[PDB]
Amino acid sequence: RARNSAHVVFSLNEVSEFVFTVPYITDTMWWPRKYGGPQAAGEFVAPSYICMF
Amino acid sequence: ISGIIGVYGLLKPFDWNANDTGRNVGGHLLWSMPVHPQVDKDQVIQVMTQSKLTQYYLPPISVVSSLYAYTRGSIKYKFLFGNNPRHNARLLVAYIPGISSDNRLTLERARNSAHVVFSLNEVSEFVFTVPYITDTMWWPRKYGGPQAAGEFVAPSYICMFILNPLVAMESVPSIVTIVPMIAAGDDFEVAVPAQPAVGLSRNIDVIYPKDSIISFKSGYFPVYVGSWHSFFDSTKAILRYGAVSDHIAQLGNIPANVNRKAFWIVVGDTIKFKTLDKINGTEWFIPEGEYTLGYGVVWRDGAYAYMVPYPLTPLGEKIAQYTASLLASNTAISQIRPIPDYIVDSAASKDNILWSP
Amino acid sequence: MDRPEGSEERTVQTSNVVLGETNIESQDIASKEYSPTWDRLASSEVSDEYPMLTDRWLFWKSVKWEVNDSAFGKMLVQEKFPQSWVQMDVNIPNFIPFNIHQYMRADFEVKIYVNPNDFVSGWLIMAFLYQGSEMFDYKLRRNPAALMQMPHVLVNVGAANEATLKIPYRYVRPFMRCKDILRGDNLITGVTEPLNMGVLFVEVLIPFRTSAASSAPKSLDVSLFVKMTNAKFTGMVDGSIALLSKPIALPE
Amino acid sequence: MDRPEGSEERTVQTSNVVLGETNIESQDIASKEYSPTWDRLASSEVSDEYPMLTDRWLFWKSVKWEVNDSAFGKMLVQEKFPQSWVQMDVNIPNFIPFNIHQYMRADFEVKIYVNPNDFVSGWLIMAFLYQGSEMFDYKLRRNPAALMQMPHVLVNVGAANEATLKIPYRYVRPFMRCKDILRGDNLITGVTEPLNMGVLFVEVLIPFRTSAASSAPKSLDVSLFVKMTNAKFTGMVDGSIALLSKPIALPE
Amino acid sequence: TPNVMQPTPLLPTTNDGRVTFGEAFNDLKDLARRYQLYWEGTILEGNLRAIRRNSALVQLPLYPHGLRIQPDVNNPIWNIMRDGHIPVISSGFRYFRGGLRLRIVVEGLNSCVWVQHHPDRPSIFSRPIIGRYIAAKDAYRNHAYAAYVQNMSVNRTIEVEVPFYQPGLYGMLNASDNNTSFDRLRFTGLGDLLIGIEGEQPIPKEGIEISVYYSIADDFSFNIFCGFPPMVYCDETYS
Amino acid sequence: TPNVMQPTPLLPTTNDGRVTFGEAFNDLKDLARRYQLYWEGTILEGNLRAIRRNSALVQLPLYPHGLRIQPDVNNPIWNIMRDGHIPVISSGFRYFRGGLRLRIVVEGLNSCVWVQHHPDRPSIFSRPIIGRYIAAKDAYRNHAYAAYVQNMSVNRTIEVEVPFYQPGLYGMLNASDNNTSFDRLRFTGLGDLLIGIEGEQPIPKEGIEISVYYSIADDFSFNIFCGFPPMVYCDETYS
Amino acid sequence: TPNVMQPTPLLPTTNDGRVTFGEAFNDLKDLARRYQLYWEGTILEGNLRAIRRNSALVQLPLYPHGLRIQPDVNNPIWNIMRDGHIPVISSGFRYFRGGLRLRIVVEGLNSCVWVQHHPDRPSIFSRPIIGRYIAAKDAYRNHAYAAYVQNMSVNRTIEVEVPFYQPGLYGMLNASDNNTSFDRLRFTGLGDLLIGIEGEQPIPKEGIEISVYYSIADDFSFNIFCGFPPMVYCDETYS
């Protein structure tokens, strides 16, 4: 199911370092911080999820 | 070809009632059929006949297409409505590619394909030029020359649905007959000449797999009732094909599935002939006069088979009935003799006479 | 009418579909039509447009209103726009130009078709209200007197006439989500209503009046069409990475 | 309608006669219209033309079709064209532009007039078939499905509309005889049918449907007109040098 | 409402890409046919007259629309599938003005065969007549008629072209059969074709088989388009 | 039929002579209002928490359409005549993008007062909450939020401008109150305003009175016109 | 690694002197073949139907890759040495678009013979079928199909060219035999060829022998190269 979204396939063949620059795909322009000042009893949610298979 | 197949042909009409509280609802399927040059036999005006061939009033595009193997192009379906300004409605006619029936066909699915929405608001005529959506370039004809036991399939299916149910009034006819008409698009083409899938209705007579008894042989007709010196000293009647001696009309290949005790009947054009005294023990007697040939009994003489004439009369059918039974039991030739008599020759037939068990 | 054929009927053609009309429309636009420029500022992923699929005119619903149920204010259709999700059970279906993608945006056009006789009278009023479902006075603004002040088209039943309502995209996102993000508390991250840009209102402006005859039609069908001028999709996911919840109907 | 007078009605004027129409026609031509050039190659005698008489529009018949007799395929008129010979007994009459001359030729124009109410529905189809009486499948081609493929005009009863069918001269002679030459055997010199160029077909395309009311008209009259563009006569004889036989009707 | 009339078109798509009728295939498809189709069967000795000298064996009426179909069990090509393309093509038209090409095959003989053409002979038959059963004063070879004498030792297929000799404007096709006019006997058919054998010598025991194939010509034309008569499907010739 | 549509006009007279909206009077009349209207009442000692230090006394949700009206007998300005111009003007529109100006008056104190602004705080309240009865972790002064500290010895009216900090295209006004979404808590209000007293010293016996007036700004805009909701006449508030 | 790929060549010598394929010999050798190879055997009287009129004697499916080989002791040319060049050449390719040339030899008859071509007939047979044992409604001469009528008195070898009439992009060769699709019946073969005898007269006691030879054409092309299927050596046909 992860292959049906923005993904990358890294090879580990004599390679020790690489970077996966993830996009910013959001319904809005700016995204509220997940953690914040004590004001409410609920932590906001992140816009996306990164998974390594 | 483009000129001819452009001419509109009429298809089987249907009534469109506004008072029907069941069929006149949003979503109902009013009319549908496969999309191909030829027209589905059930969507064509038909004229059937007992023991004959069914006649189909095919449109210009269909007749021509039956002369060619493959075909392609858009098709123009003109819908004519028998309404007046008072009537009002909306129909959604669609073109579903890859489908040939309405087993899984609905309005809410037809909107997902090439379709058109016609309004019936002071409008009596419009045309829905359906596309040519195919996996291939040319498409084989649905109907063809007898060569296999299967009719090919059309590439698509056209369906007419109800969007806004027909509404009429009290002072207006609730029935609006619809007359679908077909013509070929400007991009319509016909590929390769093949065996006509149609024939003329000039003569609808045919010889089905029905055990017709073979009309003698070719070259052994026309035939007439005559005499034969080896057949009871030429006093009885047989069918000849020539005045010259040893010229008796021979029958063709009689199928081996026919009963040995069976006699025959004329199934086509026949001839008149004049012909027997009363037989012992029975009241069977034929008055001297002119009768129409109807029945007959096969007389075999080696590899050649001939035919013995019998008048078309309730009496003659029974006499030929017995004669057919006597020959089945190998009765003496002299005992079967009391077979119609030979009085004089008779008029020749136009052509080959047919027979049946 | 006056020809061997009927009168000449106007035509409207989009991708793979054709609509026919016979009379003059009644139109209006929700708000100032424009070109989205801050949407590229919400997604890093390239947007996608499917003109052949999104520009198509689709028929989604047909409602019947009879004289006995035709009263001033009678709501013939009250649904959240845009929500045209139809499936065998109450469950966006992939059977049409619909995509199971995270985010999207587009401008909409609503056409209402009604086909009455020459001898009936009545009036329908089709209006639209941007995010009316989120207003504290929603149920209070359903009355035709309030519908007259919102962007709206009028349908006359004493004339056979069509109507189109242009509804340009307006929202606070500016990308609305097609599916749910359900993991949030009521205090922070409340559940998000998928594709809820507003509420489409059709109602009875003037009670449907027919002839007193028995053989006369007492019910009339109101069919609707919807289309998208330009659609953009920026959320690419598995068709079943997120799921569709039962549409929460909101009637008064 | 909309004026102190009625609507403005179109007019068609020929020699000594005027026809009025109110709506748009439905027309078609039998075959490619032309100018006869081999006719002067058939007669040594100078041809004659009578524009003032032959160009006139004449009314010859008016048939009534009711709902009870209106069925799909119902033949309202089936006569051999051109044969417009009318006399006290069944017996060409000199009372109109008709001549008792041996040979003639001309192009014809057929106009069908029908005058229905605003509240009826039905369809008539007027077709023509060149020398259909001589075809071995004549009686088989009378069905409207076959009439649609022949040159024809359509009449709508849901609209009051006229129709004209242009029929240019086509024949094997190319001069058809007005009277008989009866002295011949069936094997050679068979009897010649005077003025038999074809068969004019009008029929019921869609059954005549009226209102269910008692005081409503259940019968409608179909009137016909015929005219000749250019006529030529080349056989000059005594009006009684040859005689007219009783027209052999040919119905199915 | 001309035969081709589209009042209000609702075309959802563009037209299909134009091919020429000869591109994805290599022949130009239009309605012209010089394809040869059959016309008759076989003859035996017992069919000919007592004095078979200068007496034709076959009297063939010349019709562009072919002969009147007659189904036999000896000949299934007429029974299971109807007559060829030509008579179904001519069924949609009214008049013709051209000549016909005749290809004739005579197989049971190695003796000379003749073929003569009688333009002015009234075509009042819809079926060929053979030998004795032919009307007298017919199937007698004439002197000053277009003819072709051919030896079967050299070639047993005769190819001739029958001309159009009618004293009229057109030629009528699809002519009725039994009871008249002056247009059905001299203006319908091109005339009659007589096929005979140069010798009076008896016919071989096995008999002779004559298959006549024909085609259209160049000076031929189907002039006026008429409606198509209802057809019969060959595919339903078993039930 | 656009919202402004005149099908057939029957105008018997000419138009009235044009004035400019500022001629027979001297101001230009258009729909823009920086007129200040009230928002809250008074507070007593018994309302504040046991430890009133860095604990705000008022939690003010920021709504362009004002607060949810609540009639009292102690406050007739809400009861005999409904809320001011601003919330009736915003009732005919759907979205806003500007900041608000707040003028705040504190009268029973001569000690320092603070005012802080919390943009990202979800606006899920339609009424201000005071002291002890305020939700915990709220009405606690934060560190890095826009604020203004003012001494009542110098001036007892605070004038500040609350900015528009929403991560969205618009700002939603006329928001429902009780049961959600993600558009009703972060996209409707500008946030919350906390008003507290610098000292933990007890409130004077007479108590303190806080009157908050507010107005629109320049970067503010009523974007989409909606229908007007049915109104109530203030003139019929006695029967 | 394309089909032709040489990673590291170790060539000790220069190349061989170039000849043209036609120099030390006088013909240009490339893969094109109009060499004619056999296709069928002989027929007797007892094979034909009771009514052998307009009934074909042979139903020949048209395949560029030849027919399915069937070894007999009466025919050693199939048994000791496998089928000719053509079907082994077509075994290394997938598609074709051309027509085929057919040379047909009929030796036991001196009577006329016909040959007809049915393009649209589904090619679902891998072996020719004769007379009575032919499926009904097949081996019935059709009317409007490409044909050629020839007298054996003039020449007893028929040479015709069967065209390519398929409603598709390609023509599939090396088609499987027994259980389907829509690509195996209308897109594989050029159709069927029917061979019959003009007369219904009985077959001579000695019987008739029909040898069908065929070749490729110019508009023919082997489009896509596939791997070669494992072959069988004819040299090992005795152990």
Numbering used by the authors:
A (entry chain C): 163 to 215
B (entry chain C): 55 to 329, 331 to 393, 395 to 413
C (entry chain B), D (entry chain B): 1 to 91, 101 to 261
E (entry chain A), F (entry chain A), G (entry chain A): 6 to 185, 188 to 246
Sentences from the paper on this structure:
Slow bee paralysis virus (SBPV) belongs to the Iflaviridae family of nonenveloped single-stranded RNA viruses. The overall structure of the virion resembles that of picornaviruses, with the three major capsid proteins VP1 to 3 organized into a pseudo-T3 icosahedral capsid. However, the SBPV capsid protein VP3 contains a C-terminal globular domain that has not been observed in other viruses from the order Picornavirales. Furthermore, the P domain contains the Ser-His-Asp triad within a surface patch of eight conserved residues that constitutes a putative catalytic or receptor-binding site.
The two structures are similar, with a Cα-atom root mean square deviation (RMSD) of 0.27 Å; however, they differ in the positions of protruding (P) domains of the VP3 subunits on the virion surface. In crystal form 1, five P domains related by one icosahedral 5-fold axis form a “crown” on the virion surface. The crowns have a diameter of 90 Å and protrude 50 Å above the capsid surface, giving the SBPV virion its characteristic shape. Residues from loop β2-β3 as well as the N- and C-terminal loops and β2 of the P domain interact with the BC, CD, and EF loops of VP1, forming an interface with a buried surface area of 850 Å2. P domains within the same crown do not interact with each other. In crystal form 1, the electron density map corresponding to the P domains is less well ordered than that of the rest of the SBPV virion, indicating an increased mobility of the crown. The P domains are positioned in different locations on the virion surface in the two crystal forms. It is important to note that the domains are not held in position by crystal contact in either of the crystal forms. The crystallization conditions that produced the two crystal forms of SBPV differed in terms of solution components and pH, which was 6.5 for crystal form 1 and 4.5 for crystal form 2. We speculate that the differences in localization of the P domains might be induced by the differences in the crystallization conditions. The GH loop is exposed on the virion surface in crystal form 1 but is partly covered by the P domain in crystal form 2.
